[PDB]
Write a protein that binds this ligand. Structure first.
Ligand SMILES: NC(=O)c1ccc[n+]([C@@H]2O[C@H](COP(=O)([O-])OP(=O)(O)OC[C@H]3O[C@@H](n4cnc5c(N)ncnc54)[C@H](OP(=O)(O)O)[C@@H]3O)[C@@H](O)[C@H]2O)c1
Ligand SMILES: NC(=O)c1ccc[n+]([C@@H]2O[C@H](COP(=O)([O-])OP(=O)(O)OC[C@H]3O[C@@H](n4cnc5c(N)ncnc54)[C@H](OP(=O)(O)O)[C@@H]3O)[C@@H](O)[C@H]2O)c1
Ligand SMILES: NC(=O)c1ccc[n+]([C@@H]2O[C@H](COP(=O)([O-])OP(=O)(O)OC[C@H]3O[C@@H](n4cnc5c(N)ncnc54)[C@H](OP(=O)(O)O)[C@@H]3O)[C@@H](O)[C@H]2O)c1
Ligand SMILES: NC(=O)c1ccc[n+]([C@@H]2O[C@H](COP(=O)([O-])OP(=O)(O)OC[C@H]3O[C@@H](n4cnc5c(N)ncnc54)[C@H](OP(=O)(O)O)[C@@H]3O)[C@@H](O)[C@H]2O)c1
Ligand SMILES: [Ca+2]
Ligand SMILES: [Ca+2]
Ligand SMILES: [Ca+2]
Ligand SMILES: [Ca+2]
Ligand SMILES: [Ca+2]
Ligand SMILES: [Ca+2]
Ligand SMILES: [Ca+2]
Ligand SMILES: [Ca+2]
Lengths: 241, 243, 243, 243
């Protein structure tokens, strides 16, 4: 139960992000989910109803981050739980990877974690309590051909999380990563390609967005106060470390 | 909710083991906790009350294992959740470590995982559902002077868990490890402020972990909310080590 | 023996970078070491002599990268061995870390690996052989207070390397990382015995590593004796961290 | 150059073990390789010639250990380099794995590392220099269906190695693990093309590894060029697994 907690979930329009937002809300938290457009934000406001609000946010833009946080502080208060879910992909074999494909991935998937974390850190340190959870990926640990950029950012946020974790652990704040394997999403939703995927998963199936949300909710709860600088893999056995 | 689930927790007399047993019971599961003596088993039956029973079990003795399981089947049924918590320590620098000190740790902390997992596996495969969770240790991952035997067993059960996880993942069965860092126990409680300081210095969180904290992690992995997690090691060490 | 091989070592002015350049040269390789200034580039030409050359290179500037590669091709040929050693630190606790301190570390310590690798890849693919070795850090694996930016970069370059390794493994090209622990440098040498004691206490080996020790590891991975090693991280930290 | 060093390589009859023995000998070390029978021991003496000797050893019999090290001290001296290569496999899905199969793997592949390391320990600490290298396996890190026992032993030896490394690092002794992926052996050579295809599909490198490649990695770690590497696992698997 998160009664009295304020949670910020970036990229909460659908799939994993939305499941996370709905789950925290269903458990008593006041949730602020974000999208890159005003309409996408409004749609989040629509489903969260009285348990939260949707706001437009660009994790690559310093002014946007500052604007959203002020709005959150004026209507709800300080963020207790930060879930960095915003992310994108720009696949290509190295030789075909554009400088922009690399930079956009680093900025959106890695630098965003730095920016959002620093932005909520202060209040958590004062309150001597907080949760920062970033959605990584199995790719960050095993790497993947054609996704060197995505893997760099996903592996990068782990090193960041470990360092930040060491800086704020004594003040009741945990910093962790939930690394999903293949998750059933609109994209994976025609049938010779799904089986090429299932073949890599011992569980024999794709994970559900709600399954990632359950793991996030666990780490965000008071039941995981002694877990920090840790990566929780949720991949059906696709990879094991 | 564990309603209808039967859980076997080895070494449930106190600390982590007891917290795990009480937590699963409090959430609807019929729990069978074990101890190495009949008296210890009775004390477990006492705190579990109508939600479970305590049984005497020696994880290094096949006859004991089969006998215990035969009893659980008779009174409750097949085990749905297995928590391998039984474990000991026989610390010593390698140059001093006696063969018995090495062997006893291997049999009790590693071979026991093999014996108990194999003993409840068949039924799980048939139901196409199950949970096997072993309590490891940060030591199995970072190593520790004076605990080469303990570290070998704790690291070894991870390799075992990963291998088993791959064999049964398609059958709706998950096999994981929860690796505690420094947890408060009777041993640590009686340490001196000076020694506790030596321990705390290694922990970014600045405190020892609670048995209940490990139990919460175990309960999460044992639930249906962790069906997509297998062959994984969940570290609960306050930042003492990070991988 | 690297006779017949052309190696590019970024940031070879001193310490680890210079040891790497001198070691590859001593073993028969034609070495091109780089620095950020003409003077630095000259110091490198000074110690490499007839076995190589120093060039000015800014790993964050595409123009510079193209210019440098063009020069190596003109005078020496295609790069067979790439050692990404260039890097910097901009330490600070998160709340005190300026955007530019984050941006600079990411561009210099991570994006640089992407840029340089991509610039030597084609020729390697064709020759069906090559070596890409990046100097990471124990910090990339264990993390470190005050170095979240540096940690993010060193951990990210591992994720990059694993991915690249998968793309080129079938073509006789290996992509690895050598992660040093505390290495002796002019800075550490200037520390008082008390200051060093804080560092030494974190290392089981009881001493700082030698720049030459990192160079030896790099030379091993760059040789033909490590053809079956790729996407791997070789830790050289005296036991400071163990994975 | 290992001139003046005495190396003990267990299970040096063929494959990885023999390559290791021949490589260390070729580089100046006096090598003692072992086999489980007198004939196998003689065959090893035959190929080592004036650079070493073959001895019959059972890494599960304490008396054999004392005896073998006894002969070694008498003829050559104290062991400076220990390579734990002896090991076996007893595959089977858990549901059908025999106690003997589990116990045999644990004793031969894990407890053996403890016994031999402990036996050569004192001499090394006294001389403030030594090398202990154990041949692990990728299966120890990734685990493998049908090899829960092999995986437990292989993962367990890393936990063991990390702990011992911590106890002896300050004394100039390093303890490491070289973890091979699929290495070409007579067993793999007899597989059908369909089977080999199954294996190759798991290796980005697109080929099986060679015994000599593992030997080169072992020789590197055993040399003075790897004195700052300890408690580390060097993966040599062609990209089969990446950590
Ligand atoms: N799907 C999988 O199998 C899988 C596996 C492992 C990890 N993940 C990770 O899980 C997370 C969810 O991504 P997804 O691909 O599953 O879902 P998705 O539907 O692609 O959602 C991405 C979300 O991020 C937001 N976003 C994109 N660029 C942004 C920017 N510059 N600033 C702020 N927000 C931005 C999007 O906003 P709009 O709604 O406005 O477009 C959207 O809400 C990602 O971090 C991803 O890397 C997914
Ligand atoms: N305390 C920590 O900080 C910490 C940290 C990491 C991991 N752990 C792990 O957590 C688990 C709990 O151990 P602990 O030391 O915390 O508690 P403990 O109080 O030592 O309890 C050990 C339990 O195991 C049982 N046991 C011992 N030998 C057995 C055998 N041969 N057969 C069956 N049961 C046996 C004991 O039975 P009796 O009650 O009959 O004696 C007791 O219930 C262990 O696996 C341990 O390695 C503990
Ligand atoms: N020292 C340690 O204990 C330790 C431990 C782990 C990892 N490392 C890593 O080892 C490597 C060596 O660094 P160091 O700190 O030991 O030595 P350093 O003396 O700081 O050398 C850094 C080198 O990188 C070059 N460089 C800096 N910014 C550059 C840029 N934008 N473009 C191109 N080159 C640039 C420098 O050029 P100039 O000579 O022109 O200044 C210099 O040659 C780094 O990647 C570092 O992260 C060091
Ligand atoms: N082949 C691979 O792909 C691969 C991959 C990863 C790791 N490995 C590891 O590499 C090592 C080499 O094994 P292998 O299978 O490749 O070669 P192998 O030809 O099976 O050789 C095994 C060696 O160990 C000795 N041995 C067996 N039981 C022993 C005992 N009780 N006491 C003393 N010595 C004993 C054997 O003696 P005899 O000659 O007298 O029979 C033989 O010399 C093993 O530790 C193995 O786990 C192999
Ligand atoms: Ca609302
Ligand atoms: Ca792929
Ligand atoms: Ca210790
Ligand atoms: Ca984990
Ligand atoms: Ca010149
Ligand atoms: Ca520190
Ligand atoms: Ca390694
Ligand atoms: Ca397999």
């Amino acid at each position: 139960n998160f009664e009295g907690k304020i949670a910020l979930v970036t990229g909460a329009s659908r799939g994993i992000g939305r499941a996370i937002a709905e789950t925290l809300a269903a458990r008593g938290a006041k949730v602020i989910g974000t999208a890159t457009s005003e309409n996408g934000a409004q749609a989040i406001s629509d489903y969260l109803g009285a348990n939260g609000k949707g706001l437009m946010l660009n994790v690559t833009d310093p002014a946007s981050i500052e604007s959203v946080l002020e709005k959150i502080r004026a209507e709800f208060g300080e963020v207790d739980i930060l879930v960095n879910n915003a992310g994108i992909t720009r696949d290509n074999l190295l030789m075909r990877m554009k400088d922009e494909e690399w930079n956009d991935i680093i900025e959106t998937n890695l630098s965003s974690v730095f920016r959002l974390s620093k932005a909520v850190m202060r209040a958590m340190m004062k309150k001597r309590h907080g949760r920062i959870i970033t959605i990584g990926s199995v790719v960050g640990t095993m790497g993947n051909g054609g996704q060197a950029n995505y893997a760099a950012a996903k592996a990068g946020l782990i090193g960041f999380s470990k360092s930040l974790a060491r800086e704020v652990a004594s003040r009741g704040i945990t910093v962790n990563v939930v690394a999903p394997g293949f998750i059933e999403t609109d994209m994976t939703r025609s049938d010779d390609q799904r089986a090429g995927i299932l073949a890599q998963v011992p569980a024999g199936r794709l994970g559900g967005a709600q399954e990632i949300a359950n793991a996030v909710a666990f780490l965000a709860s008071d039941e995981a106060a002694y877990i920090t600088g840790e990566t929780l893999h949720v991949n059906g056995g696709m990879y094991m470390v």
